[PDB]
Amino acid sequence: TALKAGEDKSIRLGLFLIISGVVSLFIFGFCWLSPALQDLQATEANCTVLSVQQIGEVFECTFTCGADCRGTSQYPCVQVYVNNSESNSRALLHSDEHQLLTNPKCSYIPPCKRENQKNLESVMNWQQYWKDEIGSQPFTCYFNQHQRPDDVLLHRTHDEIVLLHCFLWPLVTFVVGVLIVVLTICAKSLAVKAEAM
Amino acid sequence: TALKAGEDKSIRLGLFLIISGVVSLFIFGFCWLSPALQDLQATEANCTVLSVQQIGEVFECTFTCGADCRGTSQYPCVQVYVNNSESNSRALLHSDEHQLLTNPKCSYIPPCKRENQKNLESVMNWQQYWKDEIGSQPFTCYFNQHQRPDDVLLHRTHDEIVLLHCFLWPLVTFVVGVLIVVLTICAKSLAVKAEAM
Amino acid sequence: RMWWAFLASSMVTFFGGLFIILLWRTLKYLWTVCCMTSVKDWAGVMISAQTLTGRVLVVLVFALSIGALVIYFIDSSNPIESCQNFYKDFTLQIDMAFNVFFLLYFGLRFIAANDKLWFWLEVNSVVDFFTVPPVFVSVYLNRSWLGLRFLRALRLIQFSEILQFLNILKTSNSIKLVNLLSIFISTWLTAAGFIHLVENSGDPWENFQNNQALTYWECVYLLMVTMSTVGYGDVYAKTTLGRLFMVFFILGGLAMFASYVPEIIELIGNRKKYGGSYSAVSGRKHIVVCGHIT
Amino acid sequence: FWLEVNSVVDFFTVPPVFVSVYLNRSWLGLRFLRALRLIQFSEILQFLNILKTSNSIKLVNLLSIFISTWLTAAGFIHLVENSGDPWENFQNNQALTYWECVYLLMVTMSTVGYGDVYAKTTLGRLFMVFFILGGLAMFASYVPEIIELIGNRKKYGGSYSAVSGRKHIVVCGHIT
Ligand SMILES: [K+]
Ligand SMILES: [K+]
């Protein structure tokens, strides 16, 4: 009847899951807060397109062909300006943070393909799609008037579902850890009290 | 009455601030003297502009857009030549050492902005500002005829206030260190002599 | 930008306070060459130490020091350009609400510790002079400064007292082990703070231009990769001051701070101990055997 | 039994493979934990009577704990580097092979540290700080690995295989 040996290992596992949950919440706190404390300063706003055009500049992109392919091809630079109605002023439209950081000169990147004509067509059909909407159509768009009043985005930096996963799952392990030790101390200390009958 | 324990710690702190002051002056000596022994060989002189122009070359600069932005844009090369009256000879005007070392080809760098027109205007208005003063107007300017007779600067390599801070503050800690030990040895050795009454 | 006024508030309070305490002792010495004191032993002293319910003057100031250190971890993560979160939020407002306690607790220690001079140059007093005045300057100027606040990590050294007062920690051997372990963690986090400061600001003879944007966690990692002697060189100190600090931390960290011998004697001293009390459980009979047992 | 280590290795191996054949899609998850089964390799050599002295059983037990821990820690680095940090949208991942992670662990734990390969993700750096601090100064820094090494050298024999046709004699008492 080895119940003492299993029980103490059960209590040690409960304490481990408590401490692991607390420490995991602490770690994920410090590394998520830089992204989160940036994106909560980026406001949702209404904006309207002033113009769409090519500026005659040409930029490189990387295409793929399987097996770590070092494929590269050029494409033409489009710019789009908006009136940001939350500041009554110009900004460039940039779609998302990855696009902006991979080329901050231009409003769009075509999905870089094997043939130049496929880059050209993609940029031209994107330009043509925006040529239909140079007007008062309010665009729900993301702006950072706190430290970056120059560019505006169509999308946020993170999908909040993974942020929430990254805090609910460690909190679940903390809750399981305390629930393990609170349930098990009864099956330890009160089981002997009721077996003594 | 623990005065012996505090006192010896006071003497050790005074000796520490003496040695720390001497060593800090020694360290800051070896690393400031390379800048200082360069700039004291760069003489102040009078010089006058011979010509202002663009040479038709074009150079890159780095602009910023927030969040470690890898923005880059081109600008046109201006050159300005002077007669350096301390040598009766040609030199290029270069404004400052950081400008010279970031592009030694050209006399000026525009503050690199998001749009090419803002670089062009900046260089053109700088050129136009100097087009008003192609003449006998003596320019107080810095030249190094000892080892660099080719380029002349409007500004020195260092602001002497930080050099002076960097020697006065460690000298203050040496003075405080000796003043601590000289004041405290009386409150140690003469206090008991006057309490024995 | 301003910076030296924050530093001066600590340098002037510490050295000025050393001199006024020294000169108050000196003028009492001169007085014989020229020829409420009960309340301080009553108030605060009766709850600060060796008085059982004193958790409000130890466990609390520890938990506030950990909170102030966590707030420093938060603060060092930003590019310092914000003009909205660094005010009426979980930043300077709460930082001042934690630091005002340290002013009161320092005053309470000052009025109790009769020997002012030994108390003034006590290590935990020095940690207060390099923490508290800068935060008054920061709320007066309404501008945070990421200065020597990391020194709040040096408060972890006395964490053994909390586990001992709460009777969580048993043998004197385990108290020595936790004392050594806390000196390692607090020294690691302190040295990482000095590298952080010294790399994010350039060398002054270089006009501060050669700075490197290391995070505090890259400095914690750099110290571990260095002191284990792995040294990948994926991260390393590039400034002249940072290289001087790494030469000091290599020479002081190895061969003086490490190269103890009691860390093994206490480790085997934890293994010799055959028990303490025999929790006598009810309903079971019991017997004791002694004499020549072999 | 439930929280026994070898039971935990089964819970982190078996259900994922049922999910994989149900979805008809392999997943390169915690399967490397199967390397933790090598620890009991001493039992096989002992049951087959290949392995002799209790001293040699202790030596092989220690040696197998090193190999299984090395291959396990290399699995955790492999997983944690081929998937990015989640706060980075998983974009900062690094394409280390499992053998580059085995090599990285050896170059690190010997304290050579060339830095031709190293962990780049924030999670990988947290794991390397843990494996440096736990691998040195706790997992290494044993003392019985030398006592068992010299304990293997003291032993003067076991049985005297008596060969046929040769005569034999035994000498004892004060032999010096
Ligand atoms: K090494
Ligand atoms: K290296």
PDB file of C-alpha atoms in Angstrom, chain A residues 74-160:
ATOM      1  CA  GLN A  74      11.491  43.423 -59.919  1.00  0.00           C
ATOM      2  CA  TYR A  75       8.099  45.238 -59.786  1.00  0.00           C
ATOM      3  CA  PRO A  76       6.883  48.894 -60.229  1.00  0.00           C
ATOM      4  CA  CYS A  77       6.245  51.163 -57.208  1.00  0.00           C
ATOM      5  CA  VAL A  78       2.612  52.225 -56.556  1.00  0.00           C
ATOM      6  CA  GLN A  79       1.740  54.981 -54.072  1.00  0.00           C
ATOM      7  CA  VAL A  80      -1.699  55.732 -52.593  1.00  0.00           C
ATOM      8  CA  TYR A  81      -2.371  58.812 -50.432  1.00  0.00           C
ATOM      9  CA  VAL A  82      -5.401  59.278 -48.132  1.00  0.00           C
ATOM     10  CA  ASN A  83      -6.979  62.097 -46.191  1.00  0.00           C
ATOM     11  CA  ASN A  84      -7.041  60.647 -42.642  1.00  0.00           C
ATOM     12  CA  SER A  85     -10.286  62.223 -41.296  1.00  0.00           C
ATOM     13  CA  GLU A  86      -9.109  61.766 -37.642  1.00  0.00           C
ATOM     14  CA  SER A  87      -6.308  64.335 -38.465  1.00  0.00           C
ATOM     15  CA  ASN A  88      -7.763  66.086 -41.610  1.00  0.00           C
ATOM     16  CA  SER A  89      -4.324  65.478 -43.245  1.00  0.00           C
ATOM     17  CA  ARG A  90      -2.353  63.357 -45.765  1.00  0.00           C
ATOM     18  CA  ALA A  91      -1.051  59.864 -45.038  1.00  0.00           C
ATOM     19  CA  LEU A  92       0.236  57.030 -47.300  1.00  0.00           C
ATOM     20  CA  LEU A  93      -1.855  53.830 -47.424  1.00  0.00           C
ATOM     21  CA  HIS A  94       0.345  50.788 -46.579  1.00  0.00           C
ATOM     22  CA  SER A  95      -2.058  47.788 -46.010  1.00  0.00           C
ATOM     23  CA  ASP A  96      -0.073  46.061 -43.148  1.00  0.00           C
ATOM     24  CA  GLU A  97       3.086  46.270 -40.967  1.00  0.00           C
ATOM     25  CA  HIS A  98       4.901  43.421 -42.801  1.00  0.00           C
ATOM     26  CA  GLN A  99       4.359  45.135 -46.156  1.00  0.00           C
ATOM     27  CA  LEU A 100       5.466  48.499 -44.729  1.00  0.00           C
ATOM     28  CA  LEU A 101       8.651  47.060 -43.151  1.00  0.00           C
ATOM     29  CA  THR A 102       9.539  44.972 -46.291  1.00  0.00           C
ATOM     30  CA  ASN A 103       9.238  48.063 -48.540  1.00  0.00           C
ATOM     31  CA  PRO A 104       8.332  51.429 -46.862  1.00  0.00           C
ATOM     32  CA  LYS A 105       8.625  53.305 -50.237  1.00  0.00           C
ATOM     33  CA  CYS A 106       5.490  51.785 -51.870  1.00  0.00           C
ATOM     34  CA  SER A 107       1.803  51.182 -50.912  1.00  0.00           C
ATOM     35  CA  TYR A 108       1.647  47.523 -52.111  1.00  0.00           C
ATOM     36  CA  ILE A 109       3.821  44.437 -52.802  1.00  0.00           C
ATOM     37  CA  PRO A 110       2.612  41.932 -55.456  1.00  0.00           C
ATOM     38  CA  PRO A 111       2.977  38.237 -54.443  1.00  0.00           C
ATOM     39  CA  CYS A 112       6.355  37.884 -56.158  1.00  0.00           C
ATOM     40  CA  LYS A 113       6.083  35.426 -59.088  1.00  0.00           C
ATOM     41  CA  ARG A 114       8.357  33.724 -61.625  1.00  0.00           C
ATOM     42  CA  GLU A 115       7.458  36.032 -64.539  1.00  0.00           C
ATOM     43  CA  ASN A 116       7.707  39.885 -64.636  1.00  0.00           C
ATOM     44  CA  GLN A 117       4.342  40.136 -66.469  1.00  0.00           C
ATOM     45  CA  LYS A 118       2.651  38.477 -63.402  1.00  0.00           C
ATOM     46  CA  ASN A 119       4.118  41.154 -61.079  1.00  0.00           C
ATOM     47  CA  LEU A 120       3.081  43.925 -63.555  1.00  0.00           C
ATOM     48  CA  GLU A 121      -0.474  42.602 -63.928  1.00  0.00           C
ATOM     49  CA  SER A 122      -0.869  42.132 -60.155  1.00  0.00           C
ATOM     50  CA  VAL A 123       0.220  45.747 -59.429  1.00  0.00           C
ATOM     51  CA  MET A 124      -1.920  47.061 -62.343  1.00  0.00           C
ATOM     52  CA  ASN A 125      -5.064  45.153 -61.226  1.00  0.00           C
ATOM     53  CA  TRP A 126      -4.462  46.322 -57.614  1.00  0.00           C
ATOM     54  CA  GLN A 127      -4.092  49.928 -58.928  1.00  0.00           C
ATOM     55  CA  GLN A 128      -7.241  49.433 -61.106  1.00  0.00           C
ATOM     56  CA  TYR A 129      -9.167  48.046 -58.069  1.00  0.00           C
ATOM     57  CA  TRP A 130      -8.295  51.272 -56.148  1.00  0.00           C
ATOM     58  CA  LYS A 131      -9.002  53.524 -59.234  1.00  0.00           C
ATOM     59  CA  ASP A 132     -12.692  52.514 -58.782  1.00  0.00           C
ATOM     60  CA  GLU A 133     -12.674  53.927 -55.173  1.00  0.00           C
ATOM     61  CA  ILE A 134     -10.780  57.274 -55.319  1.00  0.00           C
ATOM     62  CA  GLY A 135     -13.576  59.105 -53.454  1.00  0.00           C
ATOM     63  CA  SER A 136     -15.537  59.806 -50.250  1.00  0.00           C
ATOM     64  CA  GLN A 137     -15.935  56.080 -49.374  1.00  0.00           C
ATOM     65  CA  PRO A 138     -14.823  55.984 -45.752  1.00  0.00           C
ATOM     66  CA  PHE A 139     -12.163  53.389 -45.172  1.00  0.00           C
ATOM     67  CA  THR A 140     -11.874  51.827 -41.699  1.00  0.00           C
ATOM     68  CA  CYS A 141      -8.089  52.071 -41.279  1.00  0.00           C
ATOM     69  CA  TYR A 142      -5.419  51.955 -38.509  1.00  0.00           C
ATOM     70  CA  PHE A 143      -3.238  54.989 -37.667  1.00  0.00           C
ATOM     71  CA  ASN A 144      -0.642  55.830 -34.996  1.00  0.00           C
ATOM     72  CA  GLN A 145      -0.908  59.623 -34.370  1.00  0.00           C
ATOM     73  CA  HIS A 146       1.024  59.060 -31.067  1.00  0.00           C
ATOM     74  CA  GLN A 147       4.419  58.280 -32.717  1.00  0.00           C
ATOM     75  CA  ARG A 148       4.025  57.447 -36.500  1.00  0.00           C
ATOM     76  CA  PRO A 149       1.783  60.106 -38.255  1.00  0.00           C
ATOM     77  CA  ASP A 150       2.778  59.364 -41.904  1.00  0.00           C
ATOM     78  CA  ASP A 151       1.382  55.911 -42.908  1.00  0.00           C
ATOM     79  CA  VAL A 152      -2.005  54.130 -42.436  1.00  0.00           C
ATOM     80  CA  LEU A 153      -2.830  50.377 -42.438  1.00  0.00           C
ATOM     81  CA  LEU A 154      -5.822  48.193 -43.449  1.00  0.00           C
ATOM     82  CA  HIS A 155      -4.892  45.457 -40.872  1.00  0.00           C
ATOM     83  CA  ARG A 156      -3.580  45.138 -37.275  1.00  0.00           C
ATOM     84  CA  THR A 157      -0.153  43.730 -36.303  1.00  0.00           C
ATOM     85  CA  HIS A 158      -1.530  40.622 -34.489  1.00  0.00           C
ATOM     86  CA  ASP A 159      -4.621  38.351 -34.626  1.00  0.00           C
ATOM     87  CA  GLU A 160      -5.904  38.694 -31.000  1.00  0.00           C
TER      88      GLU A 160
END
